[PDB]
């Protein structure tokens, strides 16, 4: 029948495209993922954090300067974790002198403040990301008392943090940028971190493949 013939022709076309793509890859076709990025695939509960710490001492000689977290809260995601499991993370060992960037939702603002306190940090700052549209207007949202049009990145700090590698009074606490793919943080957060800590060691937890950047150690199930 005709549909079989059309399917066969489309199969041949996509086969030729497939074969060209793997020929190009075998030739040495580079990827969108930058070099000098250290991706780690694991589960953070089952992760052997001592091995990661020992490797970081062996190569870099000192622990991470900025830690960013976008925890999988029990609000709906499809891969959530309990608040006590996230609290049980050995975050106190991964860092001694530096910043932590935790993206908190409104429902988890208070528990985020509590965990940042328990981990040994002091809440000193907070960056608001105001969502823009393609037209340049404010993107609306949903809430209980008010409409939500922003997201919060609570910023704690512990230990000696002004030691010649962090920069003070750098960039605004507001990011007015367009909404990219779902749950994807704006790209300007990495530029702000670069302004805060130039060419340092950074660790990001619960990472996806779109979060891979130069000099960033990333830990995630899909990454």
């Amino acid at each position: 029948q005709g549909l079989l013939q059309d399917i066969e022709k489309r199969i041949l076309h996509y086969k030729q495209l497939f074969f060209k793509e793997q020929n190009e890859i075998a030739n040495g076709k580079r990827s969108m993922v930058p070099d000098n990025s250290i991706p780690i695939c694991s589960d953070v509960t089952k992760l052997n954090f001592q091995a990661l710490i020992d490797a970081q001492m062996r190569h870099a000689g000192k622990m991470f300067d900025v830690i960013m977290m976008d925890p999988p809260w029990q609000l709906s995601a499809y891969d959530s974790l309990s608040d006590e499991k996230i609290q049980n993370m050995p975050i106190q060992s991964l860092q001694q002198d530096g910043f932590i960037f935790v993206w908190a939702i409104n429902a988890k603002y208070r528990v985020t403040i509590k965990m940042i306190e328990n981990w040994g940090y002091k809440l000193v700052d907070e960056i608001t990301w105001v969502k823009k549209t393609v037209n340049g207007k404010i993107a609306k949202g949903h809430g209980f008392y008010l409409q939500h049009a922003k997201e919060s990145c609570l910023i704690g700090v512990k230990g000696d943090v002004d030691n010649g590698r962090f920069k003070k009074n750098i960039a605004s606490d507001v990011i007015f940028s367009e909404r990219r793919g779902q749950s994807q943080k704006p790209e300007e957060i990495y530029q702000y971190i670069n302004q805060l800590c130039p060419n340092g060691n950074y660790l990001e937890i619960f990472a996806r493949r779109n979060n891979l950047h130069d000099n960033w150690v990333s830990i995630g199930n899909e990454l």
Partner: protein, 257 residues
């Protein structure tokens, strides 16, 4: 482009500054040497709202005066005073955690947040062209709002305000909301984000026509705490650290004097 015709539209809409009401049954004015040291259980009972117009004394605000965060702890809010209602309070960046912990140790649960995005007026004036008093700043803001189609080509990130702060530059001012459960709320009618053109000397001291925005937000969030004449024999909204000149109808104004 900027779309500032839509981000600053509330400043040309049907929001005028409201004229104060004299001492009558519609408003009540109380003069107290200190709210943080006095018993508020007698000035009003069953308060459906409690806005604390607190200006805080922090390191960010340099060479200024204001309240102190340690003095909020010993502010008694008896249950008879305050059974069901929302408490509103201005927050700095240094004291947000202290505010939330102190309010949790009293019976109030954090529910929401409200921030003001600040655009500088000097930048807007310079883009338009190619110690100030309050009336002078008012007429400058009117001038900016008039020629609102000359700076339309400018990049909005170039007009934002960038005040000095130890970690990231200050561009917003936030109002925290806490709730105590023992309200007939109206839910989603105001966004968490509002844009304002402001003078750079002290943006924390919100002026009129924006304080009016906050009053309208609070009074549309709580459409049953309005003082209808004759129907209600007691006021249901209390605003601490009031302005000695403008007594908003339907509120209890407490002025430190």
């Amino acid at each position: 482009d900027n779309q500032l015709s839509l981000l600053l539209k509330w400043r040309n809409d049907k929001i005028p500054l409201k004229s104060a009401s004299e001492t009558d049954n519609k408003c009540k004015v109380v003069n107290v040497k200190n709210i943080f040291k006095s018993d508020l259980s007698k000035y009003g009972a069953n308060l459906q709202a409690l806005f604390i117009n607190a200006l805080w004394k922090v390191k960010s605000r340099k060479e200024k005066e204001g309240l102190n965060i340690n003095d909020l702890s010993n502010l008694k809010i008896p249950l008879s005073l305050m059974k069901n209602g929302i408490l509103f309070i201005w927050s700095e960046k240094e004291i947000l955690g202290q505010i939330v912990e102190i309010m949790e140790q009293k019976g109030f649960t954090y529910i929401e947040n409200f921030s003001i995005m600040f655009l500088g007026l000097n930048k807007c004036l310079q883009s338009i062209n190619h110690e100030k008093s309050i009336e002078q700043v008012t007429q400058e803001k009117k001038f900016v709002m008039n020629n609102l189609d000359i700076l339309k080509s400018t990049d909005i990130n170039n007009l934002f305000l960038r005040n000095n702060y130890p970690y990231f530059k200050k561009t917003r001012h936030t109002l925290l909301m806490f709730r105590r459960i023992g309200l007939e709320l109206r839910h989603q009618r105001t966004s968490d984000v509002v844009f304002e053109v402001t003078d750079e000397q002290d943006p924390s001291k919100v002026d009129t026509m924006m304080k009016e925005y906050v009053y309208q937000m609070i009074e549309t969030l709580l459409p049953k705490a309005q003082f209808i004449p004759g129907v209600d024999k007691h006021l249901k909204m209390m605003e601490l650290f009031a302005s000695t000149d403008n007594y908003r109808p339907g509120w209890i104004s407490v002025i430190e004097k």
